[model samples]
Target: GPLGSPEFSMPHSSPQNRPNYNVSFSSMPGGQNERGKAAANLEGKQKAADFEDLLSGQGFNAHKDKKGPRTIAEMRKEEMAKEMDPEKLKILEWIEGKERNIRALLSTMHTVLWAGETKWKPVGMADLVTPEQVKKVYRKAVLVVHPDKATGQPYEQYAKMIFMELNDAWSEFENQGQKPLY
Candidate 1:
């Protein structure tokens, strides 16, 4: 045999002529994409679980809205037409002034409550809540935010701030002489 025209034409080196490394490179334990072999093995299991959830139509166990919304006509009517007592009127005015703080209380109240503390929805001013209603909601709120209960949970041990805020407001409202719980 004999060589071709220009010393074998330099082999026509282009990207198409480049050797495919995927088969060999992927098989090699080349530092495991910097995540280690064991770390990557778990990914398949996770993906498998996700696929199974999708196929089973369960998804990621999305919880149902068992606690339905409650906005009663009685609640609304009373909220509107209740004769605003002078003392109660003043209390509401005070409550109105501290609406931001009240908002915080309700917001934080929802957060800790929704953390599997209590299923009872926290009462709000959406209804004309008398101090008697406060007493019930307060007791439940206090129980949930209690040191014993909150300490049992894995969250930060700062719920005492809410506890203090709750008590502080309770005392302020207490001085106002709450409507007796009948």
Candidate 2:
């Protein structure tokens, strides 16, 4: 039943099919942290070249590493680590916390007054936040930001922008909190 039409049996024009979107930049481009940008730029350039080769029917291996073929998990791990490492993951955790703050803010259905501040003060909230409430909102935000979760259309940029803003807010919160800014 899952079989496609006869056209589905057509062979690929190239030896392999490569993704056009850089899995790294598919999240946030100029919006990532400085270190992330550096790593992402490298992968972006490689993917771009590979995509160009595919378009010209040259092949996907043209830009791939010649060490040997890699498994899907290996490829995914490599892509995930392109802009990620120990220190960055720490920063990412901090960013997630700040993003949780934004989620809590949104859950209250209040308007954020000062967009410039790290600890945002809502104009419409009158009640204090409980730990349970924060957890609920934080969970929702995670689903919203996950790459696999999406509308029928492409919306990575929109999601990434919101996440970036949350990261910025988180940075400010850390600066004012026990942890000083890096």
Candidate 3:
């Protein structure tokens, strides 16, 4: 009847908005139609993932094991995605460093240092998780460093302290229910 280019027909100026003079507790009327719920979810997940990266950077160690724990398919999948952020890399390396340290102090000297093809490559933290492998190496490791045995006088000056460190490592793992295959 008395209109100025039909402005009222627009969703923005519809008569429904006129009632907002009351203290209505409804959600925004602009929800869902334009930007989409899925986009919001994607943004939420992105933020959630960032915290893992932050924590990764905060913790220690930065070792890089070429043999990460996964199938080629998984590796390939990882390759398809962006390389882990520096934060995730920090976490991976930190765990890897611990792996090397514990094994170095405990596993037998016979545990060959990063051997090549045709020879036995030393077992690593990644490899020692088999039902027999971890326990077998663990026992050999303790034997290798036990005060009365392989550890005696060879690596003196707190070989026993390192022995304590080695024992402490095992105690923490076993105590927590974090057994790999033990």
Question: Largest lDDT belongs to which candidate?
Answer: 1
Model 1 agreement with the true structure over 1-182: per-residue lDDT tens digits? 25556654567774566776566643765444767456535434334444334334335776543476675433443442344434334433443455334323543455433245556565555432465556656777676667776665653243444565576666656654354422
The residue-by-residue lDDT of candidate 2 on 1-182, one tens digit each, is 27656654657665667766656644775554766544635444334454435335346465644597676445444444455544344443443454535433344322322122234333233332443444445445445555564343244333343445544444544444233222
Two-way TM-score contest, 1 vs 2, winner: 1
Taken over the whole model, the C-alpha lDDT of each candidate is 0.50, 0.43, 0.45
Question: Candidate 3 lDDT, tens digit per residue, 1-182?
Answer: 36557645656653443445445386666445567455544333334555445434443767533576774445433332344544334433433456444444343333321122133334665665443665567675555445674333433323333444456556565544254434
TM-score, prediction 1: 0.35
User: Which sections of candidate 1 miss by over 4 Å?
Assistant: 1-108, 111-114, 176-182
True-structure lDDT of candidate 2: 0.43
Itemize residue pairs with steric clashes in candidate 3.
Answer: none
TM-score attained by model 2: 0.27
Candidate 3 stretches with Cα past 4 Å from truth are 1-121, 150-154, 176-182
Model 2 spans > 4 angstroms off: 1-105, 108-132, 174-182
Angstrom error at residue 27, model 2: 25
After TM-score superposition, the amount by which residue 144's alpha carbon in candidate 1 deviates from its true location, in angstroms, is 0.9
Clashes of each: 0, 0, 0
How large an RMSD does model 2 have? 19.0
Residue 62 displacement (Å), model 3: 27
